């Protein structure tokens, strides 16, 4: 009677974070883990404190059909190929996915249970079997500002993001680090010399970033020492796919199908490891006292952390350096903007790999087990 | 005969950029440059391609009051000390300053002549003697979007910035580079090994940024591999001084004393050397076609660079890596936002040391010579 759960893409980065969290929370104690692979069939699986079967074929429909749940971080290409063939074979199990492939599908639900647990529960009773993790940007934003939407105060939102390299992949994180190392190495001697001219240092650093030898295989441009104001594919409307997801996924999570909330902005890649930062211009539909706003925000969930709008505490708490590897979602710089009393400014930071990827997936798995 | 111009703060970072630009434009052909010092009286001045007198005492009121023009990049502490004494001595010469000291004074004009040449000309005719460079953020924004303000289309503007280390100083730029080096050095061996685990690399990097040995003296926090959502001193209204300067200096440059255009947002420090980037939400007061907006923007001045809203060109052109050391001020990602047709999104990048500091100063000097 214990559910057999198929783990796909566990070896990948997001999957590795998922593995780490599931191990910490002892998730494997309550399920029968079946690890699949697209390269090493028959090989050894990861240690989960119990005996498991050897690695099985992730493309074998016969194998997958025996599963009650499929938890995949393998990617959109894998989902696009296997999922339709599996459903056609009559598989009626639950499909939990990190990839964006099935997010906007009519028979699927974008999961972020601290925000839309009731949506998930109703979908489960309705017979929905597809539950997809939301885009990191949207998930991290809603984890921070869920209280405002829950109060029905948000008219629109303009989101300018500061997104980490982790969102692009493991090789991109490595490239960012190599780029930082290359930038520093070019002036390593000069940095030791106090009498070295800063403009000479700056000149050499700029040349290094522009040089061919600068590692730019995965980004196509320097990230370290710079930034990239475009993430994911270009769309015919002038949006990047990353920016398009902001409005589409926010309103689906909140189930705002009739009157959707306008969400837009610019998605920018910055030189951070695995934390997304977002500077937000928020239009509220009425004048609400700031302290009440802070109350609505902080009381929504136990992971959001209201950082007082003071300098040294903001410098220490509201940064990728302070958030990385943690489930904490700090939000600060909360104040009324000069445009009017209905204009709210906000800055938030969140780990891209946890709440922005892995954590909603394992939590969705636990929800299935509690039913 | 030839105007005697005093140069203060020529040796510093902004001053050095100023000297190099004045050399390139051959400004020293038109003036008698008198170089002053706060540390090396009688010493040797910079190489400006012509015979100059030995360094004079920058605190000598007797010498300073003989000067037709004073162009200082020495700093606010110097201005606050010398300027009142100098005016008290009956000095009626012109004062050109990079420091923010006299910006909001009624007898002073914030200079950005491609944007407010007419304001400058009227001030000169009126007898105004004080001409001050604007804050880097404001100057760079207006160089890109001057065409919209000139057409009187801007209702308000929300500015989320991505600011470089150069705005904080030379030692901050050095710290940024040292931070990048420390980050890379902690995982140098792992990066060279293709089979290394990404989560192990990430763990060590996160640990390094948090360690005490991480160079954070000047920023008070990690910048490399992170960001800092607070620049300059905290104000009682919840703004930082940097954010406050947005509305204050924009409207003074435009000479809008009556009904000021609301300008607000969040000023964030990122790991860039000397380029400020800004993500903008612009509310227009009229329905204008996007192509007409592009025309107004690009036709305003020959330094703004309209980057077509396409992925490849944006990645290549609209970055600190591309802009660094140039007088080009690219603006891109221009499109109407989901909130409405009067909401305009824009992303711009500009060099902080040129148009954000040194360039409006030497240009103001040229204007004085053309009187
Ligand atoms: O980004 P993301 O985390 O969402 O997905 P990701 O890490 O890009 O996923 C990579 C996928 O490719 C395979 N793979 C190839 N080389 C690998 C390596 N060196 N380490 C781990 N997996 C590797 C894995 O599948 P298999 O483990 O099934 O080959 C994994 O599921
Ligand atoms: C903006 O832009 C303005 C310019 O600031 P900044 O960053 O250019 O100032 P900075 O680089 O800190 O230099 C300021 C002054 O400090 C003195 N100084 C002391 N040690 C120095 C060194 N090792 N190298 C160069 N100069 C040194 C120089 O004056 P002396 O040549 O008189 O010693 C220089 O003019 C600021 O007021 C800010 O508000």
């Amino acid at each position: 009677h214990m559910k057999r759960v198929g783990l796909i893409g566990w070896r990948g980065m997001v999957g590795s974070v998922l593995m780490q969290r599931m191990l910490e929370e002892r998730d494997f104690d309550l399920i029968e883990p079946v690890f699949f692979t697209t390269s090493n069939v028959g090989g050894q699986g990861p240690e989960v404190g119990k005996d498991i079967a050897p690695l099985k074929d992730a493309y074998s429909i016969d194998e997958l059909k025996t599963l009650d749940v499929i938890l995949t971080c393998q990617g959109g290409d894998y989902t696009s190929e296997v999922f339709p063939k599996l459903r056609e074979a009559g598989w009626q199990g639950y499909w939990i996915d990190a990839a964006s492939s099935l997010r906007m599908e009519d028979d699927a639900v974008i999961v972020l249970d601290p925000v839309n647990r009731k949506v998930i529960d109703q979908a489960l009773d309705a017979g929905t079997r597809n539950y997809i993790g939301g885009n990191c940007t949207v998930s991290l934003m809603l984890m921070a500002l869920g209280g405002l939407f829950d109060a029905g105060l948000v008219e629109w939102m303009s989101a300018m993001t500061y997104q980490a390299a982790s969102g692009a992949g493991a090789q991109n994180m490595r490239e960012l680090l190599k780029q930082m190392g290359a930038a520093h190495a070019s002036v390593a001697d000069d940095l030791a010399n106090p009498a070295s001219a800063i403009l000479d240092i700056d000149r050499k650093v700029a040349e290094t970033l522009r040089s061919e030898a600068f590692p730019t295989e995965h980004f196509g441009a320097p990230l370290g020492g710079s930034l990239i104001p475009w993430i994911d594919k270009e769309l015919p409307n002038g949006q990047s796919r990353e920016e398009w997801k902001a409005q589409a996924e926010t309103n689906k999570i909140l189930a705002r199908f009739k009157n959707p909330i306008p969400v837009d902005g610019i998605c920018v890649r910055v030189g951070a490891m695995r934390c997304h930062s977002q500077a937000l211009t928020i239009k509220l539909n009425k004048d609400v006292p700031l302290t009440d706003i802070e109350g609505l925000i902080s009381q929504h969930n136990p992971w959001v952390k209201l950082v007082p709008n003071h300098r040294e505490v903001s410098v220490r708490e509201l940064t990728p350096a302070a958030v990385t590897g943690t489930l904490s979602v700090p939000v600060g710089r909360l104040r009324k903007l000069n445009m009017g009393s209905q204009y709210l400014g906000a800055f938030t930071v969140g780990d891209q790999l946890l709440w922005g990827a892995a954590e909603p997936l394992r939590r969705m798995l636990r929800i299935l087990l509690e039913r």
Side-chain angles (χ1 to χ4, degrees), chain A residues 265-311:
Chain A
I266 308 172
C267 289
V268 184
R269 186 79 69 188
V270 297
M273 282 294 286
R274 54 179 280 177
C275 280
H276 286 355
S277 299
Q278 299 183 53
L280 314 154
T281 305
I282 310 171
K283 179 71 180 303
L284 304 185
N285 50 30
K286 67 179 182 182
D287 182 17
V288 184
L290 182 58
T291 51
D292 292 348
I293 291 177
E294 298 171 3
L296 292 172
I297 292 177
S298 63
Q299 290 296 123
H300 180 266
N301 67 80
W303 296 276
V304 58
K305 182 181 182 181
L306 169 61
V307 182
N309 192 21
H310 300 285
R311 187 178 186 182

Side-chain angles (χ1 to χ4, degrees), chain A residues 138-232 234-257 260-276:
Chain A
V138 178
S139 297
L140 295 179
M141 184 271 288
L142 290 182
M143 286 296 298
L145 297 175
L148 294 189
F149 292 93
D150 196 272
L153 293 179
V154 182
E155 175 174 329
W156 54 255
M157 177 178 303
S158 185
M160 306 306 183
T161 68
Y162 303 61
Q163 297 181 44
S166 70
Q171 299 306 312
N172 289 70
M173 302 173 60
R174 302 175 70 101
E175 186 170 280
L176 170 61
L177 295 169
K178 290 182 181 179
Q179 285 179 354
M180 288 184 176
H184 170 266
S186 63
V187 290
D189 298 330
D190 299 321
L191 288 183
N193 193 340
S196 64
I198 183 61
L199 290 193
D200 288 331
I201 297 177
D202 173 78
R203 176 184 55 84
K204 298 167 66 178
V205 169
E207 289 176 27
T208 298
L209 264 64
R210 293 162 173 161
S211 69
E212 166 181 271
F214 205 66
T216 59
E217 175 184 353
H218 298 286
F219 279 113
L223 179 57
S226 186
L227 50 78
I228 304 172
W230 202 296
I231 298 178
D232 210 328
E234 171 177 351
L235 293 182
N237 70 321
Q239 271 183 330
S240 71
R241 172 62 71 169
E242 191 79 355
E243 293 157 0
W244 179 92
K245 289 177 175 179
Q247 177 167 289
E249 298 192 19
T250 297
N251 287 290
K252 175 161 185 177
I253 291 173
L254 301 170
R256 285 287 293 262
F257 308 115
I261 300 177
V263 183
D264 213 339
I266 308 172
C267 289
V268 184
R269 186 79 69 188
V270 297
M273 282 294 286
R274 54 179 280 177
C275 280
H276 286 355

Side-chain angles (χ1 to χ4, degrees), chain A residues 34-43 45-56:
Chain A
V34 188
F35 292 92
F36 288 82
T37 175
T38 61
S39 60
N40 189 24
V41 177
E47 182 61 36
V48 292
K50 63 165 60 175
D51 292 333
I52 61 177
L55 297 180
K56 298 194 177 304

Side-chain angles (χ1 to χ4, degrees), chain A residues 8-16 36-40 55 58 73-75 98 166-171 353:
Chain A
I8 315 167
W10 54 270
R11 196 168 63 102
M13 179 176 67
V14 173
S16 297
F36 288 82
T37 175
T38 61
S39 60
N40 189 24
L55 297 180
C73 302
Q74 186 71 20
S166 70
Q171 299 306 312
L353 288 178

